[PDB]
Design a binder for this molecule. Sequence first.
Ligand SMILES: [K+]
Ligand SMILES: [K+]
Ligand SMILES: [K+]
Ligand SMILES: [K+]
Ligand SMILES: [K+]
Ligand SMILES: [K+]
Ligand SMILES: [K+]
Ligand SMILES: [K+]
Ligand SMILES: [K+]
Ligand SMILES: [K+]
Ligand SMILES: [Mg+2]
Ligand SMILES: [Mg+2]
Ligand SMILES: [Mg+2]
Ligand SMILES: [Mg+2]
Ligand SMILES: [Mg+2]
Ligand SMILES: [Mg+2]
Ligand SMILES: [Mg+2]
Ligand SMILES: [Mg+2]
Ligand SMILES: [Mg+2]
Ligand SMILES: [Mg+2]
Ligand SMILES: [Mg+2]
Ligand SMILES: [Mg+2]
Ligand SMILES: [Mg+2]
Ligand SMILES: [Mg+2]
Ligand SMILES: [Mg+2]
Ligand SMILES: [Mg+2]
Ligand SMILES: [Mg+2]
Ligand SMILES: [Mg+2]
Ligand SMILES: [Mg+2]
Ligand SMILES: [Mg+2]
Ligand SMILES: [Mg+2]
Ligand SMILES: [Mg+2]
Ligand SMILES: [Mg+2]
Ligand SMILES: [Mg+2]
Ligand SMILES: [Mg+2]
Ligand SMILES: [Mg+2]
Ligand SMILES: [Mg+2]
Ligand SMILES: [Mg+2]
Ligand SMILES: [Mg+2]
Ligand SMILES: [Mg+2]
Ligand SMILES: [Mg+2]
Ligand SMILES: [Mg+2]
Ligand SMILES: [Mg+2]
Ligand SMILES: [Mg+2]
Ligand SMILES: [Mg+2]
Ligand SMILES: [Mg+2]
Lengths: 386, 63, 106, 174
Amino acid sequence: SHRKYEAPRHGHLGFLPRKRAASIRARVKAFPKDDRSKPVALTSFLGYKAGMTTIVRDLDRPGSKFHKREVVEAVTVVDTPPVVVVGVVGYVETPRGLRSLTTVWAEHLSDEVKRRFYKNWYKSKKKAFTKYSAKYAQDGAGIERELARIKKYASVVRVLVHTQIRKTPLAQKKAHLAEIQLNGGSISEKVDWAREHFEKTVAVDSVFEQNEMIDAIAVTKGHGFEGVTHRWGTKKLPRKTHRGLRKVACIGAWHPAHVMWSVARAGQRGYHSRTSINHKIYRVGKGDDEANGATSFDRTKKTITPMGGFVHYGEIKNDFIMVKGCIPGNRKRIVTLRKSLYTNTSRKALEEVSLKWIDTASKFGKGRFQTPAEKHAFMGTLKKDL
Amino acid sequence: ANLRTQKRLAASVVGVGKRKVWLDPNETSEIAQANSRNAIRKLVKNGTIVKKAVTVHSKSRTR
Amino acid sequence: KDVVTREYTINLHKRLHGVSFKKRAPRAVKEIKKFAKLHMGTDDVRLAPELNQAIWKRGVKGVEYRLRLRISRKRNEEEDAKNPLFSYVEPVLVASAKGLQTVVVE
Amino acid sequence: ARYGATSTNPAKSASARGSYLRVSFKNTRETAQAINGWELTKAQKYLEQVLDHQRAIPFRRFNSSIGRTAQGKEFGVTKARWPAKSVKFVQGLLQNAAANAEAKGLDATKLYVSHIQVNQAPKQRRRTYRAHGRINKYESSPSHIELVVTEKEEVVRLTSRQRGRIAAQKRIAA
RNA sequence: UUGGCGAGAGACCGAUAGCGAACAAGUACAGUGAUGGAAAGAUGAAAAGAACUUUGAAAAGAGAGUGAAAAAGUACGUGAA
RNA sequence: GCGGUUCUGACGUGCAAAUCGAUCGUCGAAUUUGGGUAUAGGGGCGAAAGACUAAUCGAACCAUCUAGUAGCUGGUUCCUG
RNA sequence: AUCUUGGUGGUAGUAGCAAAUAUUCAAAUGAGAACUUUGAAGACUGAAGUGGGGAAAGGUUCCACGUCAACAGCAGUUGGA
RNA sequence: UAACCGCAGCAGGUCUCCAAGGUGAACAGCCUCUAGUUGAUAGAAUAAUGUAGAUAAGGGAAGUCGGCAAAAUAGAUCCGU
Ligand SMILES: [K+]
Ligand SMILES: [K+]
Ligand SMILES: [K+]
Ligand SMILES: [K+]
Ligand SMILES: [K+]
Ligand SMILES: [K+]
Ligand SMILES: [K+]
Ligand SMILES: [K+]
Ligand SMILES: [K+]
Ligand SMILES: [K+]
Ligand SMILES: [Mg+2]
Ligand SMILES: [Mg+2]
Ligand SMILES: [Mg+2]
Ligand SMILES: [Mg+2]
Ligand SMILES: [Mg+2]
Ligand SMILES: [Mg+2]
Ligand SMILES: [Mg+2]
Ligand SMILES: [Mg+2]
Ligand SMILES: [Mg+2]
Ligand SMILES: [Mg+2]
Ligand SMILES: [Mg+2]
Ligand SMILES: [Mg+2]
Ligand SMILES: [Mg+2]
Ligand SMILES: [Mg+2]
Ligand SMILES: [Mg+2]
Ligand SMILES: [Mg+2]
Ligand SMILES: [Mg+2]
Ligand SMILES: [Mg+2]
Ligand SMILES: [Mg+2]
Ligand SMILES: [Mg+2]
Ligand SMILES: [Mg+2]
Ligand SMILES: [Mg+2]
Ligand SMILES: [Mg+2]
Ligand SMILES: [Mg+2]
Ligand SMILES: [Mg+2]
Ligand SMILES: [Mg+2]
Ligand SMILES: [Mg+2]
Ligand SMILES: [Mg+2]
Ligand SMILES: [Mg+2]
Ligand SMILES: [Mg+2]
Ligand SMILES: [Mg+2]
Ligand SMILES: [Mg+2]
Ligand SMILES: [Mg+2]
Ligand SMILES: [Mg+2]
Ligand SMILES: [Mg+2]
Ligand SMILES: [Mg+2]
């Protein structure tokens, strides 16, 4: 008989199966539509989630009760040192979908990248690309022919880049390698661009700008095997329930005589791939800048690193991206930032953002001071200082 | 060795509980030979077996 | 690998973080054995009874945060044991375990 | 005497057996299969490593609802274990067989385990007490084990028509 | 004349049969008690029941031996499923 | 100490053929209890529930009459013609 | 024949061996020590006791020497074996 | 909580004597001395679901057959009933 009262189902059947993602680096599954009039450019970039902090700015939203008033907003800082370009892949359209025709690699790969081709680096003889590099000997006609292939046949071109994980505070030495699609220009212009950046770096300021909406693609924080109550949000059963109460009481009718795929069950929670869209960029930070935590209103020379370091992360000595709100993944996780797939023309999307103040107190407790100097002024002299 | 008997007899001869007899761990061979209450009596005389002191319960704080 | 003696501080606080109370002092014993194996490479670790007293001084859940230990790698002279060397761990009678570096002893 | 089916030369073989051993049959069968066919020195080292939890015995038949382990990977399995009581009994038998081979004067460097076989011995019966005044069996499942180490060592009918063809063929080739 | 004693027999049963009981059986064991009440035969002609050697802490193994046979080793004829 | 209300808690192939925990009733008498002693099966005993009478009660247990009767259920053993 | 007696599987190396706060270090013994003995330490019963005696009941369980096949649902050199 | 009964070395049951210090009304609970014990398969890890024990912003029985469970109250002195 019909369920006595209606309610929406628990959870979304578009995110099944709730399983452990296949890699720790989430795949970009769609790149922006290519406009071949524009100059050649990366459509995405790699970074590492540092942490979150807090911002003040004035709101420019006519008609809002908070128009021209200060709001405080959470932000996420992604540590984005420059990516090195180390190769090109040409894809060709087929009636079975895109297929990679050939890859060409740079002559010289760093040990950051070479490490990605080994499970036991320390014991290896380190032979990766040793015969390949010798293709570049003579003029290197072998490379020239493979590039000519790409120019002749390819319908889309992607560059292989790697992170410079050495520049981060992370314990890992093995860089992450990823294909990023080149938009803009002809196929020939794209493969030239790629050729003229082999071994060169690409800086986040080339890709992103202040106020641009971007998408964050990352594997979500893991939580291991989870019960139905927290994994799906089902209602806890009454206190009088024999045999436990964090459960679904009825897992099906008698017919179909099968448990249906749509019923909530216990299993893996977290470590899923996710693509969150429309995160506005509030700051593209320079690493060299000693005042990258300062603003026009707050002229205090300071970096974005909060007192104590970002908890479980470290300093931020590199270029960075500051994005409104939160993104998938935990501190230290590789993250792919992607250009918007569409042209948003909301008033929310078009707002030009100017930060009054960036919080930089310690996140390892109830931090009261923005800088060491601020602390020393308020406290005065202590016994250790003497 | 198994001195379980020696500890029982020592308690009886010294007139204290088994929890207060101390059997010298360096003199296990000699103690193992003490089958009789006489034998145990000699061992107590030459300090191979000793009566441990009572654990103190002071009445100092009470007073 | 030679005969050596060194004095070490073990941080027991960080190693017993979160351990069940009835298992703190027993776990401290195993943690000291593991630490001797790290530093001396010897599977056979012997703890002096006096060290055992030091670990258990404040009962089963009152293990000191830092202990100073003298660890002596010594030649095993017993028939034909599996390991030719063993470590002996003994306490260092000191006021405070704080502020000390590893040092060698002659 | 009288072992299971064997196919080796008895002159180049030594044998050992143990009967009514109070050790799990299901565990020893798996242990025995783990070394069947191995060079004898290799089998001894491996059995030492199993006692040290460095390598495992793969459990191929009697393995329902055991646990999974990375030490299974060298043998292609997920389910492996370290049955110490089985391992000890089997090492006693390999020691006995090696000695027996030395006494016959076989070459210890070329010995391999050519036959190993564990059989179920008669059960040993205790009882367990269950709810509501019931009694059930609580039996041991002992083993017979036996092994043998061995030195390694390294008209045409044709119809008249076919005959005629063969002749014609050679008359042309020449 | 289904008891007792002494005899002779059988187209009877052949160790889950025949008396409950071929055997230290009205036994062991159960029950407060009246009562209830089993299982359990077969090395070989003869113990000739394996000296001695070797591996093992030992049980045992491997040899050697006894025997017509250990494809008879007392966990003993045959030895099914 | 004696009891056994509620959780309709634990357990529910148990620690247990009635237990465990918490909560609870009573706690100087129509009180609790050891031993001795009396009452025995259409009988006893019952501040009464058909309760209790050796894990047995709207008629105990044991043996015998007894292989009790069954218009009812189940089974009923080789081949071919 | 939910047949009778006996034997044997799959289930399965699975359920499980989680109440009563708690163990640790060294030496000895020994083929072998989480479990034996001694010593050191840490704890508990907390005198309406896990202490010291008895009644019913048991019947040698007491004590020593030897000693581990079985039994003490892990072990065992220990034991009410 | 292993000598008795309960199929057993079973968290059950089974009559009684002796009885220290502190806190406190107290043979309550908690801590200790004399005496006794340190038994009860262990090691590693710390998912879900449990069992036992807890805490919770704002609201305060809207939950449910039903305030079931839990919380709140709590000793003593004075007042006031
Ligand atoms: K319904
Ligand atoms: K399993
Ligand atoms: K009979
Ligand atoms: K025969
Ligand atoms: K009548
Ligand atoms: K009766
Ligand atoms: K009658
Ligand atoms: K009829
Ligand atoms: K009885
Ligand atoms: K209500
Ligand atoms: Mg409806
Ligand atoms: Mg949520
Ligand atoms: Mg219920
Ligand atoms: Mg924080
Ligand atoms: Mg914790
Ligand atoms: Mg399965
Ligand atoms: Mg049971
Ligand atoms: Mg019973
Ligand atoms: Mg008969
Ligand atoms: Mg014959
Ligand atoms: Mg036979
Ligand atoms: Mg068959
Ligand atoms: Mg109760
Ligand atoms: Mg209930
Ligand atoms: Mg259950
Ligand atoms: Mg009625
Ligand atoms: Mg009839
Ligand atoms: Mg009848
Ligand atoms: Mg299990
Ligand atoms: Mg249980
Ligand atoms: Mg123990
Ligand atoms: Mg207590
Ligand atoms: Mg106490
Ligand atoms: Mg005795
Ligand atoms: Mg046992
Ligand atoms: Mg045993
Ligand atoms: Mg009994
Ligand atoms: Mg009992
Ligand atoms: Mg007083
Ligand atoms: Mg316990
Ligand atoms: Mg609340
Ligand atoms: Mg509140
Ligand atoms: Mg209120
Ligand atoms: Mg209501
Ligand atoms: Mg309602
Ligand atoms: Mg209530």
